[PDB]
Structures are given as C-alpha cells and as structure tokens.
C-alpha cells in the first residue's frame, strides 16, 4: 500500500541529488531511509555509486561497492559497467579485471563490460594494457565488434606496433571476420 508510496519519494530526491554529482546528499538520504526501517536496495545504491563515478572518485566507488556487497545483495549490471568505465578512463587496467571476475562469479555476462573496458582504455591513451586486456579476453571465447577490431588495428599501426596488430588480425580472421583492404593497408604501413 503505502510502502511504494514512500519509496517513491525516498528514491526521487535521492536520484535528483545524484544527478548533480552530490555524494553527501545521497549518503544522508541513505542514512535517513535505513533509519526509517526499510532496508536499502540495489537501485538506491546505484545512485550512491554514480555520485562518486561522476566525480571521478575511484576509492569512494570501491567503498560504495563494498558497502552494497556487505549486506548480501548482488549489485546491478549498470553499477558494474560504470565502475569498469571509470577504471578504464583512469588507466587502471589491473583494477578492471578484478571487477570483471566479480561480475563473472555473479553469473553475469562479461562481454559488453569487456568491450567498454577496452574502448575506454584505448580512448584514454592506454594502448599496451588495452591490447593485453583484449588478448586476455579473446582467448576465453569472447568475440568483439567490428568497430573495436578496426580501432585497435588502426591505433596499433599509427603508434608503430606490428606484433599486437598482427595478433589482433589473426584473432579477427579466426573469429569469422576476414581482413579487408583497410587492415592490410595498416599493416603495410608499419611494414614499409
């Protein structure tokens, strides 16, 4: 009856405070709602995580993740995706594999998260770790999109890395997509 009626106003202002990147407001709203008797849910902790995510706060995000996990509640997919994106933007590649493993142990799918990780590592001027993550994920049977296949090859050939480009091309042809002129052209640039 009134349970959803009060949860509506409990979550509305929480999300409104999390929109403008305010963590203290979300924290005090969480304290108020747990003082009112209702146990916190994953949708509520999503705002507390995204408040730190929008303010490039990695330690606060990890603390929020540990808080959500301590009460015996599995986090949602969007929270883990935001955490992976934040760890990839900061260049912390080694801290993304642990999050991927945590998603895997929770019976999730780690395909889109792995793609977001490699894309954010490439866009953040982190090429070696991006290629390492891509090769680690490709050996496990996880295929990638054509756009990532093209971006990795283009960047590795513009930098001057031929080994990783050739390995990615071999993995692409093994997954099913055959090489086009563009790919060969990049490789020839590094070869010439």
């Amino acid at each position: 009856g009134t349970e959803k009626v009060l949860r509506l106003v409990f979550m509305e202002e929480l999300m409104e405070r999390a929109r403008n990147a305010d963590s203290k407001g979300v924290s005090q709203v969480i304290y108020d709602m747990i003082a009112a008797g209702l146990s916190p849910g994953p949708r509520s902790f999503h705002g507390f995580v995204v408040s730190h995510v929008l303010n490039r706060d990695n330690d606060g995000a990890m603390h929020a993740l540990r808080r959500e996990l301590s009460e015996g509640l599995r986090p949602l997919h969007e929270t883990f995706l935001a955490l992976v994106r934040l760890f990839g933007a900061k260049g912390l590649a080694t801290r993304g594999l642990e999050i991927l493993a945590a998603m895997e142990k929770l019976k999730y799918d780690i395909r889109q998260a792995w793609l977001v990780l490699v894309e954010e590592l490439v866009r953040s001027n982190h090429l070696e770790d991006a290629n390492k993550v891509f090769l680690k994920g490709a050996e496990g049977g996880l295929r990638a999109t054509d756009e990532i296949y093209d971006l990795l090859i283009e960047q590795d050939c513009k930098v001057g890395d031929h080994s990783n480009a050739l390995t990615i091309a071999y993995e692409m042809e093994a997954a099913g997509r055959m090489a086009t002129t563009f790919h060969f052209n990049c490789l020839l640039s590094v070869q010439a």
Partner: protein
C-alpha cells in the same frame, strides 16, 4: 569517539601509501562503533580482512563492544561463533561485552549461562563482570533478588559506583517502595566514598538548580571525559533513568541538552525535509521515554511556526537483523516505548508493516494529535 576525523586520517594515510596496521583498523572499528554507524565498522573489518592483515584479539573485543552498543544479539552470537573457529581465545572483556549487549536486549536466560561458562573457563571475573552480573537482575522484576551481588561488591571491595547505586534506587522506585528507599538514598550521600561521589546525590535532591547552584555540577560534568565514552554515556543513561522515573521530569531530561552540547549523545534526533525521527536504539526504557517526550515537545513547538510536516515520523527503538521479526516486542525498551506512546498520546503511533522494529506516524495522522 570522533569518526569524521578518523575518515580524514584514513584518507590521508591511503594517499600517503602506507598500508594501515592492525591498530589502525582496530581504532577505526571503535570510532565507527559509537555513532550508530554499524555498517561502516563491518566494512572496515572486511577491508582489514581483505588487505593482508590478521585480526588480533584486540580487534575482536573491540568489535563485540561496538556491536553491543546497539543491542544486536544475533551479530554478537555470529562474531562469537566466528572467534571460535578463527583461532583466538575468549578473554574477560569479550564476555563483558556479550553480557552488556544481552542486557539492553532480550534473552535474559543466556546471561547466567555465559557467566557459569566464565566460571568454568576460570575467566577471573573482574569488577565490570560483577557489575554486569548485578545488572542481569536489574531490568527484570527481581528487585529483592538483586542483593547478593551488592553484598559481594561491598565485601570483596569498596561500595559500588554511582552507576549501580542510582540503578538500584530506580529499581526500588519502580516497585511499591518509595519512602523505604530514602534511607538508602541518604546512604550514598552520607558515606565515605570518593569526593565527586558526594556532590552527586544533592543535584537531584532539593532544588540545587539556578544560575550559580547548577553551575557547580558543570565541573563534575566536564571532568568525566577521562573515561573515553566508555562509562560516561553509561553514567548519563543511569542518571536519567534514576532521575525521570521517580522525581521531576523537567529536572531529569535537561541533562541531555548539555550532553548533546558535549558531543557524547549523537543521533538522538533526525531532522530533514523528508524524515523527522528519533533514535533511541542505544538507550534504556526510561531514557527512551525521556527522549520521546523531548522529541514530542520539540516537534509540537515547531508545529505552530508554520513548517512543513515530514512524510513519516519514526521512532528508532530496535535495529539490526532482528528487525524483521515478531520477537521484537520482547525487547525491554520496546514494552516501555509502546506503553509510553499508548498512554501519553493518542493511538496515532503504531508499528510499521514493512519493518516491525520502530514506531511510525503518517503525515495526516501526526497533524491531528498536534492540533
């Protein structure tokens, strides 16, 4: 009992690079174990267990006290069972904290069993343990039964402290013994105990309160900071218990003002646009009723000044995993809170259906009693 400064220190230490040591998290779980921040202590202990350090017995006897401050008996049982398999012994302060947590909560039967287990393990019961054993028979209807421990305290050592004398006085006043307890009251005021124990007793008797007479007890109120929030909050709670039940209500519930100005009673009231509540989870029945009356008059005085009423007014009486249970009404504080909210005010405050661990009032309902 500072907690924000602890968080700042932890942040600066993490920024430095040095991994926090055992005692760091051991003090953190105690700083987050005195401000009703139960989940932060749990997550700090988890980080301690997930950083590369092994918790010692000090961490465990700090955690049992931090979890006993609220009254979560299930968490105490869980941590006590985990201490048996982690490979550590159970020292005296561990049993002390267990019994202290069981006191404000239910299950009065387990206390004597734990004490006989102490006797079996040769725990060498200390003064705090004997005080806890005496308090075992305090919350229950065993007034005349709670006298052999008093004699043991008077024989093996000096007369018990004021936290026991005023407790026994409130116990005597709860039953049908009003005038026969005045001689025991004069006893604590005409004996050879400590110097500060003499001035305590005249602050309740007589008037003793004005711009100068009540200024004398300010020194006694500020000198007790050496305990370190261990027995200071206990002393204030016992004082309020012995003062409000039999005495003047305006004289009893006024110590909470200077206590909040001191910083030893946090989270006693929550005020916000959405919520407006009162947390008495770490308070005894009489103190809970005092805080309820204080919050009631503080809400009614804000009723006529034209302020938006909250969507839900709650009374945090019992917290923890046990909250979703029908066994809740069995808490000592709960019976008293229900009686006080049923006899003093109208039948507008009731238990929630989503969580049976507090007392809530709907917006429209609150307006009716206010008018």
């Amino acid at each position: 009992g500072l907690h924000d400064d602890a968080k700042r220190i932890l942040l600066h230490m993490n920024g430095q690079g040095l991994v926090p040591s055992s005692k760091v998290y051991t003090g953190v779980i105690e700083a987050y174990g005195q401000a009703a921040l139960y989940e932060e202590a749990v997550v700090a202990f988890n980080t301690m267990n997930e950083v590369g350090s092994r918790p010692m017995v000090e961490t465990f006897n700090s955690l049992i006290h931090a979890f006993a401050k609220g009254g979560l008996y299930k968490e105490s049982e869980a941590i006590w069972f985990r201490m048996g398999e982690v490979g550590v012994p159970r020292n005296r302060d561990s049993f002390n904290g267990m019994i202290e947590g069981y006191r404000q909560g239910g299950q009065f039967e387990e206390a004597i069993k734990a004490y006989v287990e102490m006797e079996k393990a040769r725990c060498d019961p200390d003064e705090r343990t004997l005080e806890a054993v005496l308090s075992v028979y305090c919350f229950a209807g065993l007034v005349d039964e709670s006298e052999e421990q008093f004699q043991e305290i008077k024989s093996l050592g000096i007369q018990p402290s004021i936290i026991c004398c005023c407790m026994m006085l409130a116990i005597y006043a709860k039953s049908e013994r009003w005038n026969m307890a005045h001689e025991l009251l004069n006893d604590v005021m005409t004996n050879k105990t400590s110097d500060m124990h003499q001035v305590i007793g005249q602050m309740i008797h007589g008037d003793f309160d004005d711009e100068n007479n009540w200024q004398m007890v300010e020194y006694v109120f500020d000198k007790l900071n050496s305990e370190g929030c261990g027995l200071s909050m206990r002393f204030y709670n016992t004082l309020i218990e012995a003062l409000w039940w039999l005495g003047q209500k305006e004289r009893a519930a006024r110590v909470l003002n200077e206590a909040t100005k001191r910083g030893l009673f946090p989270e006693l009231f929550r005020r916000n646009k959405l919520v407006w509540s009162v947390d008495v989870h770490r308070m005894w029945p009489g103190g809970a009723c005092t805080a309820i009356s204080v919050w009631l008059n503080d809400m009614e005085e804000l009723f006529h000044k034209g302020e938006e009423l909250p969507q839900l007014a709650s009374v945090v009486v019992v917290r923890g995993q046990t909250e979703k249970s029908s066994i809740t009404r069995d808490f000592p504080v709960a019976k008293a809170a229900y009686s006080f909210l049923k006899d003093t005010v109208s039948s507008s405050f009731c238990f929630p259906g989503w969580n049976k661990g507090r007392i809530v009032c709907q917006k429209t309902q609150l307006k009716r009693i206010f008018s």
